[PDB]
Amino acid sequence: SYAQELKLALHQYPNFPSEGILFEDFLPIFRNPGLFQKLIDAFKLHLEEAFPEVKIDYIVGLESRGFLFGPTLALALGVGFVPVRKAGKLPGECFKATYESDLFEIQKNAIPAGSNVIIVDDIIATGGSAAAAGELVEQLEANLLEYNFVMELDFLKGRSKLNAPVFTLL
Amino acid sequence: SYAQELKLALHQYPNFPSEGILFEDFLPIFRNPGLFQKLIDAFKLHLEEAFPEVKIDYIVGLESRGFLFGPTLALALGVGFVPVRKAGKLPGECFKATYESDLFEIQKNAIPAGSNVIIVDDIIATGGSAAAAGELVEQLEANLLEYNFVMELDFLKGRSKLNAPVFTLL
Numbered sequence: 001s002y003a004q005e006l007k008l009a010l011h012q013y014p015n016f017p018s019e020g021i022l023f024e025d026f027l028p029i030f031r032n033p034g035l036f037q038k039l040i041d042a043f044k045l046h047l048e049e050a051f052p053e054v055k056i057d058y059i060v061g062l063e064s065r066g067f068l069f070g071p072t073l074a075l076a077l078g079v080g081f082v083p084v085r086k087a088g089k090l091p092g093e094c095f096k097a098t099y100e101s102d103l104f105e106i107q108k109n110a111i112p113a114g115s116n117v118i119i120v121d122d123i124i125a126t127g128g129s130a131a132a133a134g135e136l137v138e139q140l141e142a143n144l145l146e147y148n149f150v151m152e153l154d155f156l157k158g159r160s161k162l163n164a165p166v167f168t169l170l
Numbered sequence: 171s172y173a174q175e176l177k178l179a180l181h182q183y184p185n186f187p188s189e190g191i192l193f194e195d196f197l198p199i200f201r202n203p204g205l206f207q208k209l210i211d212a213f214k215l216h217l218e219e220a221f222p223e224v225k226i227d228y229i230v231g232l233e234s235r236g237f238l239f240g241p242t243l244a245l246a247l248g249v250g251f252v253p254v255r256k257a258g259k260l261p262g263e264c265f266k267a268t269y270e271s272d273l274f275e276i277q278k279n280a281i282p283a284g285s286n287v288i289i290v291d292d293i294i295a296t297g298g299s300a301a302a303a304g305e306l307v308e309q310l311e312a313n314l315l316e317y318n319f320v321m322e323l324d325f326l327k328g329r330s331k332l333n334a335p336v337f338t339l340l
Contacts, residue, residue, distance in 0.1 A: 011261070013261040013262060023261045025262070027253070027280070030241055031250040031252060031280060033244065033248050036244070036245055036251070037245060058201070063234055064233055064237055064255075067234055067238055068237055068251075069241065071200055071238050071239065071242055072245060074200070074203065074206070075203055075206055075207060075210075075242060079203060080201040080203060080206075081200040081201065081238075082197070082200070083197070083200075085234075090197075091195050110197070
């Protein structure tokens, strides 16, 4: 239901990133508060159904598109939000992880060991950046309950680079 | 009141960006939903007091820290959110603006002419990136009611590079 209305709001751009790469732009969703609320409601409903008796401590969002809906979802759930950023952006002591090359970081003091988290991002394509975020979560000695994405490019089979379960809305 | 509790949650990092540059990290605010809600409430209260009879059409947030609270504030206000991104990130036709060098873009079809908007970001330092966002808003033929920031580094006098009024929470 919501997923369908959200799918319709997406705009496709052929060869945008680069030749061959078809891009799925979810930005129009945020331009409309009604559509944005539906996106948040859809993820919240999924997490309540998937983890009925497991408390989620933090939503961990990937820079920068994961930042567009991650914090809002965290607030809707009454939980904290922590970002995974491109290296060099976060101040203080950080754990690092590499996607063979792109480097990512997370602040060491952001999440206590034993915390249960959900990693979110807009699109899972190759899955490389999400995989790196998983490693960062592992270093914090936290538990990765699931990855939640808005869209998934099946032909790239990015889900195969990820250990924890994956849920994709559209 | 809220501002005080928010100020206390900030973490300072000397010479982080680079030598001399003192960094103000607001990320701890997002780790606590109660603090995050207060940040959103504070901006909402400000905008309701400053623009009681002027409808805000969009919150325009700067990449990437402006993405952390901008969308959530937009939803709290019942308005749309549109991002200003580092060049090369947005798909489709974009307006461009340069901060003499860093280039920024905004999608041409994101905001209708005549719209009233608020530009938001976490920190205003030199004001260069915010100034560029202002130019993008001008090209969309939209009205810039105000810039809203979480923090301001007064010694850099970034506010002097900005035309529209500025409100800084802390």
